[PDB]
Amino acid sequence: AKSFSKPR
Amino acid sequence: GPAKTMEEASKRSYQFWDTQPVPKLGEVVNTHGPVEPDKDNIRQEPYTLPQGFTWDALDLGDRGVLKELYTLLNENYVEDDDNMFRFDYSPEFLLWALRPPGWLPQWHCGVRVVSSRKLVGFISAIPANIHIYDTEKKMVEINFLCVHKKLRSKRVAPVLIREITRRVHLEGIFQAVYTAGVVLPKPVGTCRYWHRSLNPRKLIEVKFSHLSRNMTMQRTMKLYRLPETPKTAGLRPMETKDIPVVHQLLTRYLKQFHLTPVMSQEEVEHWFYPQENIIDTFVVENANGEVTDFLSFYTLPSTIMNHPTHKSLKAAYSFYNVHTQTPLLDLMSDALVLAKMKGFDVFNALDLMENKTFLEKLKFGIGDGNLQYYLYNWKCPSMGAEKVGLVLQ
Ligand SMILES: CCCCCCCCCCCCCC(=O)SCCNC(=O)CCNC(=O)[C@H](O)C(C)(C)COP(=O)(O)OP(=O)(O)OC[C@H]1O[C@@H](n2cnc3c(N)ncnc32)[C@H](O)[C@@H]1OP(=O)(O)O
């Protein structure tokens, strides 16, 4: 997981 | 001063990472092998911490100690770029991730305040056999590096990295693999998270996502609606009897990628045998009774920071998905349905392996920020995302 993302 | 993009890290000086056996960010690698020889004598003493802090290995078998680590991560671990969401790994999840077969107590490396005993730092290693191009090596996976927010920017992270390196060297292992959202010397591959809305209304109210230009809330909800039951014949939860064939399917499927784990049958049991609110695995048992495919995803919610009504986002993460008779598209479609059923708000997947063949088609939206993959003390050419076949927690 490690990287927190959200829709660009 | 971290760096999230590849040319923005080119303008940075890597005081710590320049001392480490990893290729340079500008370097281009046309070779395969260790950066440096295995060391045949290893420092016996732990690296010194700043005054007032002490090493402590965490017995995660002690419920109280596990809760302290949960709280440290819950309050201080990875946030998104906007400081709106933070990972919320559960205690039972952490046990799954940190005690796979071969785990060692000294590889659960904590830092405490001498006076208060407060847990303020952590790093971990777990063993893993790693296939990288034509080489198979016993390595460790490094995860959960965390420094309390009040202790940040005090060069504590380099001490945690050196100390876990030492404790791993002591066991005769000289390579590691790890992932990070920041750019460091030097990524072997760069992946990107995509997201699939499951409860779009929740996601828009918490500003995880937004209404796309010229699309209303009613259209967006209709656009993301899913069947209530999966489509694939004979899909069912993985059971104990499925462990050997799941091992077989995964082993054969992973050979086509260039960075993969090599799991024993015991490791397959650990990583895939379903645990509620941790890991889900569904197999396809066909009309002859043969298991021909499986899908899996793990449970990782996030805290929604500073919100009066919504406190947590329930996220599902694509794990390993193996197909030999069912189309991948249909497999992932059923994964979305199963996740929706189980109450998840969003379904996350990386663009590695063959995932790009379904991401757009199943209405995933690209995320922001990358997930970089790294090897420690191993030189080899970088690879495209579709050749990465390793998923870490
Ligand atoms: C043989 C076996 C070997 C085993 C070891 C293999 C290598 C393992 C490597 C680690 C595998 C991690 C895998 C995961 O767990 S990825 C998860 C990372 N964790 C988080 O993002 C949680 C939230 N953040 C924090 O807790 C802190 O900000 C951390 C602890 C990340 C940095 O703390 P702080 O903000 O207080 O920084 P500092 O002042 O102490 O020190 C700054 C120095 O540290 C470099 N830095 C910053 N972030 C990272 C990072 N994520 N990996 C490696 N290095 C990082 C930075 O570039 C600089 O070096 P340089 O720029 O001067 O060169």
Following DSSP, what letter does each residue of B140-166 receive, concatenated?
EEEEEEEE-GGGTTSS-HHHHHHHHHH
d(CA B167, CA B57): 11
Query: Do the bridges between strand B135-147 and strand B108-113 make them parallel or antiparallel, or are there none, so unpaired?
Result: unpaired
Q: Is B368 on the interface with A (CB under 8 A)?
A: yes
Query: Do the bridges between strand B176-180 and strand B189-197 make them parallel or antiparallel, or are there none, so unpaired?
Result: unpaired
d(CA B118, CA B356): 44
Amino acid present at B106: Q
B15 is in an annotated binding site: yes
Measured between CA atoms, how close is B2 to chain A, in angstroms? 13
d(CA B12, CA B2): 9
Mutate to test the interface with A, among B279, B368, B388 (most CBs of A within 10 A): B368
* Chain A residues within 8 A of B79 when measuring between CB atoms: 4
Specified resolution (Å)? 2.1
How many other CB atoms are there within 10 angstroms of residue B127's CB atom?
Answer: 19
In a 13 Å sphere around the CA of B190, the CA atoms on its Cβ side amount to 13
Q: Do B195 and A7 touch (CB under 8 A)?
A: yes
Q: Do B82 and A6 touch (CB under 8 A)?
A: yes
Structural domain harbouring B270 = 1-393
Helix extents (H) in chain B: 63-76, 91-98, 157-169, 200-205, 217-224, 243-254, 265-272, 328-341, 356-359
Residues ≥6 apart with Cβ < 8 Å to B105: B57, B59
d(CA B298, CA B316): 6
B287 is in an annotated binding site: no
* Contact status, residue B112 vs residue B120, Cβ threshold 8 Å: yes
Q: Is B76 on the interface with A (CB under 8 A)?
A: no
* Contact status, residue B281 vs residue B236, Cβ threshold 8 Å: no
Query: Do the bridges between strand B135-147 and strand B176-180 make them parallel or antiparallel, or are there none, so unpaired?
Result: parallel
Out of B147, B155, B168, B186, give the residue to mutate to test ligand 1, the one with the largest number of ligand atoms within 8 Å of its CB: B147
Q: B313 — phi, psi (to 5°)? A: -110, 120
Give the number of beta-carbon pairs within 8 Å between A and B: 62
In a 13 Å sphere around the CA of B36, the CA atoms on its Cβ side amount to 12
B12 is in an annotated binding site: no
d(CA B258, CA B12): 29
End-to-end CA distance of chain B: 25
Q: Do A5 and B348 touch (CB under 8 A)?
A: yes
* Chain A residues within 8 A of B368 when measuring between CB atoms: 5-8
Q: Do A1 and B87 touch (CB under 8 A)?
A: yes
Return the structure tokens found at B150. 């009040």
**B53: CA distance to ligand 1 center in Å?**
18
> Which SS3 state, helix, strand or coil, does residue B253 take?
helix
Query: Nearest-CA residue of chain A relative to B85?
Result: A4
B182 class by beta-carbon count within 10 Å (0-12 exposed, 13-18 middle, 19+ buried)? middle
Which residue lies with its CA nearest to atom 61 of ligand 1? B14
- Cα B212 to Cα B193, B346, B351: the distances in Å are 19, 17, 22
Give the technique used to solve this structure: X-ray
- Cα B280 to Cα B275, B300, B328, B331: the distances in Å are 7, 12, 17, 14
Query: Nearest-CA residue of chain A relative to B203?
Result: A6
In a 13 Å sphere around the CA of B257, the CA atoms on its Cβ side amount to 26
**B287: CA distance to ligand 1 center in Å?**
50
Residues ≥6 apart with Cβ < 8 Å to B345: B198, B199, B202, B203, B208, B313, B314, B315
d(CA B211, CA B18): 44
Q: Which residue has the tokens 């899913």?
A: B226
d(CA B324, CA B292): 6
Amino acid present at B200: P
Q: What is the DSSP string of B332-359?
A: HHHHHHHHHHTT-SEEEEES-TTTHHHH
* Contact status, residue B383 vs residue B189, Cβ threshold 8 Å: yes
**Residues, chain B:** 393
**B288: CA distance to ligand 1 center in Å?**
50
Q: Do B181 and A8 touch (CB under 8 A)?
A: no
- When divided into structural domains, chain B yields a total of 1
